[model samples]
Target: MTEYKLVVVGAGGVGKSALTIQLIQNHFVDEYDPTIEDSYRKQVVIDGETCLLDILDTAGQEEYSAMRDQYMRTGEGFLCVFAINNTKSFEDIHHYREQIKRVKDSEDVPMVLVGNKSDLPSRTVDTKQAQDLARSYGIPFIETSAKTRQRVEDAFYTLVREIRQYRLK
Candidate 1:
């Protein structure tokens, strides 16, 4: 129904909160937007193209796990994020990706493999390893920090581009 439906998915932590805030930092939801359990929509341009960016935040899923499957079916693109400092979170990304793939009933989806927490002092995820995994999946992988704000825009704008190309494909 919108230009891009972006789902921010990961276990729980992994800085999804920080990433969301940083991405939509400039504006607050206005428009009585109780539209989809709760989602944010804004107009933004990238790659010389303008479109409405509709983002879904998975804030309170402890109660909506069952219905979340329904929501999953609605998302056209996803940001599959995990914390590099937490190996278990990194492992958690696998299950999320599998669920998204299964939910969409497709091998490939417009999603990004994100290794967050790059700003942390201690880290566990190997850069090359993550890259190789993304390579295998034929998806783009990038490291992001909700702290220094590195690649915060890139992670998202790149996703928009992916979704556009996906639709075209």
Candidate 2:
């Protein structure tokens, strides 16, 4: 079976853990204790192919930036996440993307720009702006709600597919 390492990154309180836990366990967590770093493994089938996924949930705090290059180097695919309600979180995604490319030493690294916390009523970053940025970067964009579990699966699935296709080429 093939294995893929996926990394989740974003600012603190952007629902990175929520999305990771919900996807792996099919359960929602109401509170998280500010993740240092966590890993989860799951066997899933995509497009009729079964594979193992090793998901790394990294700390979102800026202090953890020193560890990011190592994580970026190990990751096969990335979920660059941001909270829809938090504009500052959205602003930092470019840094994460650039870091990934620098560590991986490739411009075509598989990644997705995720706007999480879709269930929240107040949104500081609109969908169009996120989509536009993603378009410029030539990566897929998605909005997910870890609370309601909206598009959470799609985000991971899309990235995995991208990774698989990239490997094939």
Candidate 3:
């Protein structure tokens, strides 16, 4: 009976959009167009019945990344993404985390820590570090892959559920 405005934020090359596309359509876009900035819209069940979700991947339009603040301003929840192979991506998450906290003006907001591209064996981010980051943020840490199905499907629903919890409070 409600719509969730979920923003997926991570550094470029983390395949955050791939995760969004995979979830909404199950298409498994390896990397088409190199840039696609828009909200993938859909309606589905969360816990009760139907909940509309706008899972947006704005990485393309974020030329100077200025649009980040704009989107985060209204975004209800977020998937703070990083790639397992890219330690820099993991490092950048702190900025996004601080960004959302600043934009929402809430010391703590609804968010999930995501490590994308899990199928890659070139992992540089330690599991302990990821778990530590998740704990510090007070959110769940999920390792996912756009090349695989399970966690891509699980990430946003988890975010939506967090939103529900936030709304209830």
Candidate 4:
């Protein structure tokens, strides 16, 4: 199996862990503690392709800029996540992109923009904003919901596929 280091990051309370759990195990922790300094590493099989995914879920509240840099230094790719229920989280996408660029230094490295909490009806962040921001960075974007498992798999699988395809280029 191939190994892929993936980091999920965003501002506080943006459902980063929820998306991680869903992608890793198809499980969702409804009442998760966002401030909990927890990271999960696991293996998953997508489309009959197995891979060991080192997933780092960093604390969004703290000055985790260093931790994010550490992940970007070695990470194969990124899931730049934000909450649909929070406008500020969407606004923070630029900071995430900037930090990744600072560490990765490779604008071509695949990064997936994940708009989490799609199940929420009163979305504080609109889909157009997310798509436009991601487009501006030339990164792929998708709206997902851990609660409904909607487009959750797409976020990870699309990123891995892109990385694989790009490496062959």
Candidate 5:
């Protein structure tokens, strides 16, 4: 069986933990308690191949920035996440991407730009803007809702496929 390490990153309250938890546990959280760091594992099948996913949910606080390099070094793929209603979170994505690239020493790293909290009625970040930013970074873009579990699975699957394809090359 193949294995992959995926890191979830973004600013605080962007639903990084909520998305990861929803994908792994099939549960949604409405509260905004901060996360320090957490790990989850699961076995899944993708394209007829069995694989194990080790997911790391990282804290989004600036105080945790010092530990980001370790997560970047350990991750084979990443989900650079932001809430659609929060413009500041969207703006901070570049910093996360640059940190990942700096630690991984390659701009070709497998990653996806995720706009979470899509279920919210109010959205500040435009989908086209997010897509354009993702295009600039050469990464896949997706929108997900932890509350409704919309496209949450697709986001991880997309990253896993990218990781598999990247390793093959």
Candidate 6:
């Protein structure tokens, strides 16, 4: 069986870990600590076949910059998560993208720009801006809510599907 190394990153409290947990376990924690170290492994069957999925859920705080860089260097694919409820998280996406580019040194790396926390309509951070940024980065984008489990599976499947296609290319 083939294996893929996937990384999920974002600023603190942006829902990277939450999305990761929800994707893997279909569960969410109301108050999550970004500093807590965590990782998970699961199997994803694409086209009715199983593939190993090794997900490294890294710290989202600025203090973990070095470790985050290390993961980016070795990651096969990445998901940049930003909370739709927080504008600062959305702003940090560019910085994260640039950092990943510098670490991976590959413009072609498959990335999925995720706008999480979709259930909080009152806290949205300009959907247009987020979508525009995703387009500028040439990556697939999706809005998700780990709380409601809205589009949660779609986000992971989309990234995996894109990764599979990139391998073919």
Against the true structure, what is every candidate's RMSD?
Answer: 4.7, 1.4, 1.8, 2.1, 1.5, 1.7
Q: Write the per-residue lDDT of candidate 5 for residues 34-76, one digit (tens) a residue.
A: 8567899999998898989999998754535657777788899
User: For residue 24, what is the lDDT in candidate 6?
Assistant: 93
Q: What would the per-residue lDDT of candidate 1 be over residues 1-169, giving only the tens digit for each residue?
A: 2478888878666766677667887422223222224577887888777778888877543433776787789988888888888888888777788888888999759988899889887889898888988888888999998777888889988888889898877
lDDT of each: 0.79, 0.90, 0.84, 0.80, 0.90, 0.82
What TM-score, over all chains together, does every model reach? 0.87, 0.95, 0.92, 0.87, 0.95, 0.91
**Alpha-carbon runs more than 4 Å astray in model 4:** 61-65
Displacement of residue 129 (Cα, Å) in model 6 is 2.0
Q: How much is 143 displaced in model 6, in angstroms?
A: 0.4
For model 6, residues 43-77, the per-residue Cα lDDT tens digits are 88877768788888877546356776777787888
Question: In model 1, what lDDT does residue 93 have?
Answer: 76
Question: Clash totals for all models, in order?
Answer: 0, 0, 0, 0, 0, 0
Off by over 4 Å in 5: 60-66
Candidate 6, run of 10 with poorest lDDT = 60-69
For residues 1-169, what per-residue lDDT tens digits would candidate 4 score against the true structure? 9877777778878888888888777788977886776556777787688977777876653446676466678777888888889888888888777777777766777789999888889988878978888888888999999888999878888888777766887
Query: Which tens-of-lDDT digit does each residue in 138-157 have in candidate 2?
Result: 99999999999999999999
Residue 124 lDDT in model 1? 92
- As a TM-score, model 3 comes out at 0.92
Q: Is 4 or 5 the stronger prediction by lDDT? A: 5
